[PDB]
């Protein structure tokens, strides 16, 4: 379908960005939209092949976009504001009568330092042996904690194999520090299994999360580690008891 | 221009009614459905001038005076769980198939919990953290979970976890915190909790 890169973006405020959108195949409408966190998706322009027939959602001359030869698109915004944060979206349909059919977005996350952005650190919390005496249930919770911006993928890998079956994620990073603007955020996960599958020590738990931070391009000049794109993991072997 | 309720409810298996108000519609105009998934980019649902337009999904309903319109979900199931968009587009003039977005209606769709087994646990400590979890799980769908009245505790909403190979569902949150009064048995204070709750001891 239409895809869209980057998928995850964090900029210093007053830096240019560049969005991309390859839409479908044939599809001669593109539609752009910035949708803030909570709220539905805004529009801000569309393009007919190339012609960009209504660019009325525009919020400012810092937003520019185009789609030179009637396919793929850039939508760039100058000089990005805190303000500017958002999903951007992309859609394209092959006409008027279609229905139109969506890229997965690219989230942005304007901060006044990148000396704001930090990876996540991780921790897995074993089963009660209460809830496996009761249930016959064992729930494992994983937590991450501390990272900015809130671009993170949450996966639960048992034996080196990916599961999704028994897993509860939260649908969204909580902020630790509600009243500070660059707060850090934290994230929680449930992954269950039965207590037979528990109780084996030969099965290996592990929670990762995925951390979508700086690139090679961005400067980093703090005594730190360089807050780069990464996963970090913890791990639980099962338990007899 | 449209407007939706806020929010709705529904438990797995029954069928929803999402309305829509909106100004009374030409016989020409058509309304559309989209919804959101959590984290997902929207989907195209249905779209049609009449009713009796409909799928696998779902049917669209367009009252007899063209001032609202409903779309029906046959049979909700978990997955139907996202914000649902009716829109009205224009047609005819200089119409190219723009789209605009209200805020929706946040569809959550609860699971049948056929036995409540409310409970309370902590769970092991971790050694990298200095954080202490605790479990509230397999509480009834009506049963709510509220914030704490701490800043230094973190509660989430409560979720669900499909264990889809032994077809079971539980309703759960988790809460956290590095504070030495903090204890299992007083996390979920804040939250109106079945009486029968199970503390382990």
């Known amino acids: 379908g239409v895809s869209q890169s980057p998928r995850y973006k964090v900029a210093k405020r007053g830096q240019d960005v560049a969005l991309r959108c390859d839409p479908i195949?044939?599809?001669?409408?593109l539609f752009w939209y910035q949708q803030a966190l909570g709220q539905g998706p805004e529009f801000l322009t569309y393009?007919?092949?190339?012609?960009?027939?209504?660019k009325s959602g525009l919020p400012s001359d810092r937003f520019f976009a185009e789609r030179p030869e009637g396919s793929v698109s850039t939508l760039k915004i100058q000089r990005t504001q805190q303000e500017d944060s958002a999903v951007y979206l992309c859609?394209?349909?092959?006409?008027?009568?279609?229905?139109?059919?969506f890229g997965p977005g690219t989230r942005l996350t304007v901060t006044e330092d990148l000396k704001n952005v930090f990876p996540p650190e991780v921790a897995v919390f074993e089963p009660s042996e209460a809830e496996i005496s009761h249930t016959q249930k064992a729930t494992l919770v994983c937590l991450a904690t501390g990272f900015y911006p809130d671009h993170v993928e949450l996966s639960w890998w048992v034996n080196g194999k990916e599961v999704h079956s028994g897993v509860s994620t939260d649908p969204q990073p909580l902020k630790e520090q509600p009243a500070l603007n660059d707060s850090r955020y934290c994230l929680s996960s449930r992954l269950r299994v039965s207590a037979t599958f528990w109780q084996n020590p030969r099965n290996h738990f592990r929670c990762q999360v995925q951390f979508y931070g700086l690139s090679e391009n961005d400067e980093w000049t703090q005594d730190r580690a360089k807050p780069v794109t990464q996963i970090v993991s913890a791990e639980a072997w099962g338990r007899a008891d | 221009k449209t407007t939706q309720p806020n929010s709705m409810e529904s438990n797995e298996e029954e069928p929803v009614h999402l309305p829509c108000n909106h100004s009374?519609?030409?016989?020409?105009?058509?309304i559309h459905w989209y919804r959101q998934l959590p984290s997902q980019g929207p989907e195209y649902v249905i779209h049609?001038?009449?009713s009796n337009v409909n799928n696998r999904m779902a049917s669209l309903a367009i009252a007899e005076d063209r001032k609202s319109s409903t779309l029906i979900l046959h049979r909700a199931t978990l997955r139907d769980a996202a914000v649902y968009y009716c829109?009205?587009?224009?047609?005819?003039?200089?119409?190219?198939?723009?789209?605009?977005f209200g805020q929706g209606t946040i569809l959550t769709v609860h699971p049948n919990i056929q036995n409540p087994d409310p409970a309370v646990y902590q769970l092991r400590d971790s050694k990298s953290s200095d954080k202490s979890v605790c479990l509230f799980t397999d509480f009834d769908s009506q049963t709510n979970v509220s914030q704490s009245k701490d800043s230094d505790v973190y509660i989430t909403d409560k979720t669900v976890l499909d264990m889809r190979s032994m077809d079971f569902k539980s309703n759960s949150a988790v809460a956290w915190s590095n504070k030495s009064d903090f204890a299992c048995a007083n996390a979920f204070n804040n939250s109106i909790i079945p009486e029968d709750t199970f503390f382990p001891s």
């Open positions: 859609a394209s349909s092959l006409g008027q009568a279609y229905e139109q059919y």
């Open positions: 195949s044939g599809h001669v409408s």
């Open positions: 393009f007919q092949n190339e012609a960009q027939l209504d």
């Open positions: 009374t519609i030409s016989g020409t105009d058509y």
């Open positions: 049609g001038l009449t």
């Open positions: 829109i009205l587009p224009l047609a005819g003039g200089t119409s190219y198939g723009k789209l605009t």
